[PDB]
Design a protein around this ligand. Sequence first.
Ligand code: CLA
Ligand code: CLA
Ligand code: CLA
Ligand code: CLA
Ligand code: CLA
Ligand code: BCR
Ligand code: BCR
Ligand code: STE
Ligand code: FE2
Lengths: 39, 115, 341, 30, 34, 57, 31, 82, 32, 33, 63, 505, 36
Amino acid sequence: TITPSLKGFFIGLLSGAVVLGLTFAVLIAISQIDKVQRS
Amino acid sequence: PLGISGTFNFMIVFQAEHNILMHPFHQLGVAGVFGGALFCAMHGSLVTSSLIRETTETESANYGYKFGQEEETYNIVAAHGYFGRLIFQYASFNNSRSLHFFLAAWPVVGVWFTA
Amino acid sequence: RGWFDILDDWLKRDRFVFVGWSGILLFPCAYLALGGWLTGTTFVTSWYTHGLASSYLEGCNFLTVAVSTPANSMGHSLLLLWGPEAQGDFTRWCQLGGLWTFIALHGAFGLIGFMLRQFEIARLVGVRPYNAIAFSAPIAVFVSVFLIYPLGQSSWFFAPSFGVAAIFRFLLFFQGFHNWTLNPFHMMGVAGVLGGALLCAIHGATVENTLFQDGEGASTFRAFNPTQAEETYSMVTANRFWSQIFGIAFSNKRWLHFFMLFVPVTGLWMSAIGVVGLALNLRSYDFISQEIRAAEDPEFETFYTKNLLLNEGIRAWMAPQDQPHENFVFPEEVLPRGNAL
Amino acid sequence: METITYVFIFACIIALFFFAIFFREPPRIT
Amino acid sequence: SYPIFTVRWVAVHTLAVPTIFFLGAIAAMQFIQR
Amino acid sequence: DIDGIREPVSGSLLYGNNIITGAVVPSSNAIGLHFYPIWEAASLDEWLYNGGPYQLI
Amino acid sequence: DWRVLVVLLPVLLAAGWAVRNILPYAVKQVQ
Amino acid sequence: GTTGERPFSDIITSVRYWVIHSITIPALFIAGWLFVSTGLAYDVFGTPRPDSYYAQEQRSIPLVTDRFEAKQQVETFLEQLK
Amino acid sequence: MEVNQLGLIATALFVLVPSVFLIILYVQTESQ
Amino acid sequence: MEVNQLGLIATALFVLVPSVFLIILYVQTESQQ
Amino acid sequence: ARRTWLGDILRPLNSEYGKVAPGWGTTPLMAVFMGLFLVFLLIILEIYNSTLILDGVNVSWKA
Amino acid sequence: GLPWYRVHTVLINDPGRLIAAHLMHTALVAGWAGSMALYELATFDPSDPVLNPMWRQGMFVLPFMARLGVTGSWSGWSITGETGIDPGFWSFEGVALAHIVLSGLLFLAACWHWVYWDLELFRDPRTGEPALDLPKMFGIHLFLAGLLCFGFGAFHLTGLFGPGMWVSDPYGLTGSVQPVAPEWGPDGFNPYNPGGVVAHHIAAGIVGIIAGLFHILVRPPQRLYKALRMGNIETVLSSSIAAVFFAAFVVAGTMWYGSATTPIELFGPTRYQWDSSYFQQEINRRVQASLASGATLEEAWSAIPEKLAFYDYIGNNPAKGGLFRTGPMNKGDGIAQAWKGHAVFRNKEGEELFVRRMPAFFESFPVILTDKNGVVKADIPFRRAESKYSFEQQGVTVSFYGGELNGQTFTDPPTVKSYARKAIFGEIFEFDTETLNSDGIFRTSPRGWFTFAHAVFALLFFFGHIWHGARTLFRDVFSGIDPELSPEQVEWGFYQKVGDVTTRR
Amino acid sequence: EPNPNRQPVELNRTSLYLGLLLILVLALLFSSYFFN
Ligand code: CLA
Ligand code: CLA
Ligand code: CLA
Ligand code: CLA
Ligand code: CLA
Ligand SMILES: CC1=C(/C=C/C(C)=C/C=C/C(C)=C/C=C/C=C(C)/C=C/C=C(C)/C=C/C2=C(C)CCCC2(C)C)C(C)(C)CCC1
Ligand SMILES: CC1=C(/C=C/C(C)=C/C=C/C(C)=C/C=C/C=C(C)/C=C/C=C(C)/C=C/C2=C(C)CCCC2(C)C)C(C)(C)CCC1
Ligand SMILES: CCCCCCCCCCCCCCCCCC(=O)O
Ligand SMILES: [Fe+2]
């Protein structure tokens, strides 16, 4: 049985994963473009 | 009163008769002693963080300093480079005289106000 | 040269505001703690949790605004926005106290973020991490006062509310209910804080008044070069002055600056220990031998017994309004009062 | 006995002050 | 030749734009009558 | 008698105090701001009752 | 609601006004 | 040294800077002002207006006394206000 | 005053035990 | 049993004080060699 | 050093000081288990906190 | 030489003498357990598990033996109140003895490992230096831990081969040691379900066995070996201290809030049972049922067991103590002798009045009596001159139902007042204050002292983690920073990435 | 077969004074609470 708070639990879980997901997506993208130069 | 519990009595009655907690000069005094303690820890930890290696690991690092020696025992440039990055470059002192005057002035002015 | 190594290069790039891996924890949580406090003190009430106004919108000023604790009936609920109390309703969340756990929890992790930043930056610059170690005392204070203390009590309600006058109320509560001034762990904390301020002022003043004349100006600040090798003040003269003024003096600059770290850091740690005890009402409230004597001898009076009478006044006059969920009704005739007043 | 204990401890501290001042490790310029 | 948009740029603006919004809100409050 | 109401507060170790509760008690409210050296008292016992040591200290 | 749009309109306008005044220099931010 | 961004003293003395921020700043100020003057702030945050603290003849505070019924307690209080 | 009788021994050992520790370390530092 | 209360502290000091004297003398001897 | 019978029997268990799998090895797999553990602990905490209320689970002495 | 705070670092490169030191610590801890148990046996009164249970007597290790099945003494009593029992060797006395013997054998082992420190097992075959393969040791030790954990849940807790554990009803009336079947469903995670404790140890043990097998066979990746400094034993200390303060915080928590592993018959009530009037409700429920079945007030209140009434008393609340109020709870309010009975207060108009109970926050509390609607109807006044609600004015009386005073009524104001002063503490009991020279001031229970000590230790060990964590990661600069550190490395604009000398300009 | 990991330990006179002062002041602080 899925209770209301279990539905909330999953909503928080999914929201946390998306917020973390967008963050590292933006960051990996920026880091690939704006690269450090070594010589 | 000249006593430990007597001091507390004085403080409690003072609050009832003057609302000293709600007085800006006391709020300045708290900023003065809190901030004094903060900057004491900061300066101590920053100079300690940047002590120059002068001893092995089986002896106290305090023996890296000799009373009266001419050279400094820490690297203020390193301390600035650390602290400048922890906040940002210009929130950090690089002038030791300015830094130590700030240490004198902050708690003194605050305790003046609470007095 | 995987993506991890590339992300690491960008995070640790030398810029105006260093980011680092720790920045990914630090910056979101600190900004949201900050933001939630500014938001709550500007716009949000404590009417349904405390029976109080607490925002600028309600007419409070900078000293009386607060983000106040949740109602006692919430217990120790995490009070998640999507949780069983608010059920995703943002407005109801604010009304029930959710911004308090919001600030306390994001603040907790922001503090972790900041300590991690101290370690990360110290490692990259090549200095020992004593500043990170010093920052453990503020974390101990925060965790013990805002988290451990309410977790031992009935609910989040009895933690500090985030506000100036709300913290003063907290101070006075701890006097009248816990007799916290009598606690030797607080006494040690007090010694550490006042001792730290003492050291702060005496060391700065001592250095400013044993400077070498390294320039012709009357402003002595320009006579220091951060890359110079020489000490800018005279340890030898400072030592003689204090030996003859005070009897002893520092002679080792390393021990001096380590001692400046040690004193306030240890003070805060001791006070944290006393608050953990107070989480359980394990107070140093009384002296038994004094109570036995006083109960038997109506002529025996000390400052200890006088302060208890003040505590009893605090408890009975503040409890009905301070703990509205208890529905305390105290008739005038039961209120303790001295003569006339 | 408790009065005696408090006074004893206080008196030991005053003795420590005396030795700590007049019998310190002398600071040497070297 | 400096960049206009930087990490620093985001930093100062994540603080400054809400601050000014909040000040105007708080200004308007001074005129609420009961 | 700190408050001048003939209600003496015991402050010293021999009279039932410990380190935390003991005190030198402030001089009597009956004296107010008046100067109260030993030689203004009829006796040391009077001087002790009214809190003379506090002024001297 | 209408209050949501009057609170947002100066923000939208202020955002548009700044983008039109920095658009050449922001496009020159390249690579 | 410098980490490569444009010096602040340069930006705030620049004409382009004040051109852009002569608008953004007062627009944000006005937007905040409007946020309260439209009454929108009360409704977003659930803050009582000066007339909605008590019912006309009640002197008791609407304190929430139930953890899981709390949202419902508040709604019931707000409707005894009509 | 009706004080805890074990308070004397607790105080006495609390002083003596760590103090003696420090004296032992100090005197053997001096003789080497 | 109703024994003398000071008997305990008398016994502890009687043991501790002379024992500690000997230990002090012994350890500073070892660090001479 | 001193050889003993028990030492000789145990010797292979303490013989690979410093030996490592190249590169990242099983690190991706470790991350998965860590994140599963986090969600798991989160569920346990929230049941105890009565933020997560499941059918048939009454977090009370009356269980 | 070494500073006093570094003396024990001589063991860092000395695995044999490290083992010797660890043996001696283990000998010391086992010795304490046996000494503590002997002291508790020499002072424990087993004669009344109703009104003088172990947790009123300052007993600290006795409840931990009782929890896992040790319930009787060689002298023939059991903590469940049964007499004429034969516990075999595993009595309280046998457990104590076994720890004393174990301590003495560890002491001897420590001497051997201290003297014979130079064992070839501790030296690396290649380099000839003392070396410990910490990844492999972790796998071996994890594997052992999993086996023990599995066996404890599979045999001891289930009763397959072993006694089970302490389980009780929801009101702490009928506890005893019983085998416990595992609860494999979602209610296994309910901290108040004892079957969850069995299931936990079985499942977690299997996971530990498998994980131990993995950690024995698979080397750590070079990335993690370097990042965590796995060739440095101080990295293990740092992470081990972290797991230990994590565990200390959990057991402090479950002790304060209550769980199936901290039962109230061994550690006393929680403060939350007082806060929610947990026992008073159940008492009222039984009284309501009896009056329904046509019992009289006297019969209904006489049916209430003393053990249950005793839980509804604030002197058994662990949040009522003091930090320097020492010793057993019996040193405070006395040794409980008998329930006096439930006091019922009525005014001159016959209406029943209810004393407002003391909340745990308050060292003292006024006496206020309300009616069923919470209207103040009587009190004990401070200022008398304008009192409206004095007992004398309101004609307050007290009648007792059940207990020693059953069927008695008191009408004179002084006597009614003193019973109303006790009723703010909950149910009223007769105490023996003279046997222990009790001073009348409440103390906390073992639940309180345990929680305090472990919360404090947990917080301190956090500092230990930070300290040893930093020494692991900054080992290279522990004695100071590089005396020729480049200014280019530390000031701004020279290196595109902080620290990395390969990012010039 | 002496153990090479042994080290001498030190406590200079100033450390003795510092430490003696800590113990004595702590005793003076807590003794009132031990007597209660
Ligand atoms: C570093 C950033 C950070 C951190 C640590 C937190 C932390 C928190 N927030 Mg905050 N938050 C953040 C950013 C952050 N937030 C941002 C950017 C916003 C703006 C959108 C918010 C907005 C916000 C709100 C509005 C609220 C919180 C709340 C909370 C709390 C509950 C969070 C929760 O239950 O998560 C649950 C989710 C997770 C733990 C994420 C799960 C991660 C995945 C699913 C693991 C899956 C495992 C997988 C198999 C392994 C993969 C391996 C890998 C190789 C891929 C917690 C204190 C709540 C709060 O404070 O209530 C009091 C609340 O109401 N936050
Ligand atoms: C059928 C399978 C099964 C079942 C029924 C259980 C049943 C249980 N497990 Mg087990 N478990 C299992 C499989 C299973 N387990 C497996 C396969 C593993 C992996 C090996 C584990 C690993 C595991 C761990 C690691 C823990 C449990 C715990 C528990 C108990 C949870 C109830 C409780 O009191 O939590 C109470 C515990 C919590 C609510 C978690 C505490 C979280 C805190 C908040 C962490 C933060 C602390 C922070 C650092 C400091 C805070 C600072 C300040 C706030 C104080 C319960 C007996 C917990 C336990 O022993 O509790 C006594 C526990 O800690 N289990
Ligand atoms: C040789 C076996 C043995 C046995 C059968 C006992 C039995 C007992 N001891 Mg004794 N003890 C022993 C050895 C033993 N002891 C040793 C060697 C020492 C010295 C260290 C002691 C020191 C000692 C003390 C100090 C005390 C006892 C006590 C007790 C009693 C209660 C035990 C209890 O609650 O444990 C509870 C133990 C735990 C809850 C440990 C939990 C393990 C944690 C969770 C570790 C988790 C980390 C792990 C590696 C992770 C695994 C991962 C997973 C996937 C598997 C019980 C009669 C108590 C008593 O009443 O004494 C009179 C008491 O206070 N013992
Ligand atoms: C986790 C440890 C633990 C816990 C929870 C308990 C709990 C208990 N014990 Mg047991 N006990 C323990 C360890 C423990 N004990 C040990 C290690 C011993 C051997 C010495 C004993 C010996 C023992 C005896 C002999 C007795 C108890 C008794 C008791 C009970 C009353 C305790 C009391 O009044 O405390 C009083 C606690 C204090 C006064 C607090 C002391 C803390 C002070 C503040 C010192 C810390 C200050 C420090 C110097 C600060 C320095 C600062 C610096 C860092 C700068 C209680 C159930 C009593 C009982 O009823 O048994 C029947 C009893 O008679 N215990
Ligand atoms: C498993 C636990 C554990 C272990 C094995 C170690 C081991 C070590 N520590 Mg760490 N430490 C720990 C926990 C631990 N620590 C915790 C919890 C803290 C926080 C308080 C610290 C804080 C700490 C610091 C600040 C330092 C160490 C240092 C050291 C090293 C030298 C210690 C020494 O010579 O002490 C010698 C100690 C004495 C001669 C007497 C100390 C007496 C204390 C003050 C009171 C005694 C209590 C008493 C015996 C009761 C037992 C305690 C028990 C109840 C828990 C050694 C490798 C030192 C180091 O890094 O050296 C390089 C160092 O500077 N430790
Ligand atoms: C909570 C939350 C959130 C967030 C939010 C935020 C982020 C906010 C922010 C906010 C902000 C960020 C705000 C700000 C404000 C500010 C202000 C309000 C300021 C003011 C100031 C002042 C007034 C000052 C002045 C002065 C003085 C007084 C003195 C000297 C001079 C000067 C000028 C300095 C979200 C979304 C997630 C949602 C959920 C919840
Ligand atoms: C040799 C031998 C033997 C014998 C053995 C023995 C006899 C043992 C004993 C042992 C013991 C008998 C031990 C004991 C120990 C104890 C301990 C180890 C303790 C500790 C303590 C502490 C550490 C504490 C602390 C504290 C204080 C003091 C105060 C308060 C706080 C605290 C708690 C922290 C036998 C025949 C068997 C076998 C053969 C061989
Ligand atoms: C059924 C329950 C009602 C659900 C309504 C949806 C409300 C959800 C709000 C979303 C906020 C997400 C913020 C959490 C993200 C941060 C978590 C983390 O980073 O660890
Ligand atoms: Fe300095």
